[PDB]
Structures are given as structure tokens and as C-alpha cells.
Amino acid sequence: SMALPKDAIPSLSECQCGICMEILVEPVTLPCNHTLCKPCFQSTVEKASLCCPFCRRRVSSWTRYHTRRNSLVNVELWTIIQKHYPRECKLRASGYQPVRLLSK
């Protein structure tokens, strides 16, 4: 939801990808300000219909723009996640729903 105050410890639940529920890894923040982990971005966005999976904002030009500049990852957010949940980030780097409405 809102800005994390300076030096505040973020809750785990803010640091989880809202698509896959894993800790956010290499978070990608779309220009509508929704964020998802890079693996989810590749699956649910880059390789699907290039819309934000949260608000359906079109993100095809945004994706070309940043893929070309290798700047997909929100680096400041990624910094903060690894600072506060480093073990979670390591574990990930090691590898009932009535409403199924998000494609692959």
C-alpha cells in the first residue's frame, strides 16, 4: 500500500509477491506501481499478455523500454528486501482457491 518510512522494517507480507506468495525476488514494479517477482513477471506478463496482472494496465512499451535498458528490476526495493529478509531471499535463490482468474 504506502511508502515504507525511512529505516522501517517492512512486514514479511509486504515483501511477498502477490502472485505466487514467495518472497519477492528481483522485484519488478510496473508503472502503475504494482510489483511482482521477476519470475512471475516473466510468466504472467512478459510471456502472456503484457498487462499488469493487478490492474490490467498495458505494459508492452514499458517492457520493451526497460528490457532494452536492462532496468526491469526495481533496484531500491530489491535492496530493501535483501536487507530485511536476506535468508528468505537465499532460500528462494535455492528453489483452496474458488477464484482462478489469473492466466498461467
Q: Toward Zn ion, which CB reaches closer, 6 or 104?
A: 104
Contact, 61 vs 44, CB < 8 A? no
Contact, 81 vs 13, CB < 8 A? no
Q: CB 4 → Zn ion: shortest distance, Å?
A: 19
Q: Toward Zn ion, which CB reaches closer, 7 or 102?
A: 102
- Cα–Cα distance, 52 to 42 (Å, whole number): 12
Q: Toward Zn ion, which CB reaches closer, 34 or 84?
A: 34
CA distances from residue 100 to 8, 18, 43, 96, 104 in whole angstroms, order as listed: 34, 14, 16, 10, 10
Q: CB 83 → Zn ion: shortest distance, Å?
A: 19
Which parts of this chain interact with Zn ion (CB under 5 A)? 17, 19-20, 32, 34, 37, 40, 52, 54-55, 57
Q: CB 39 → Zn ion: shortest distance, Å?
A: 6
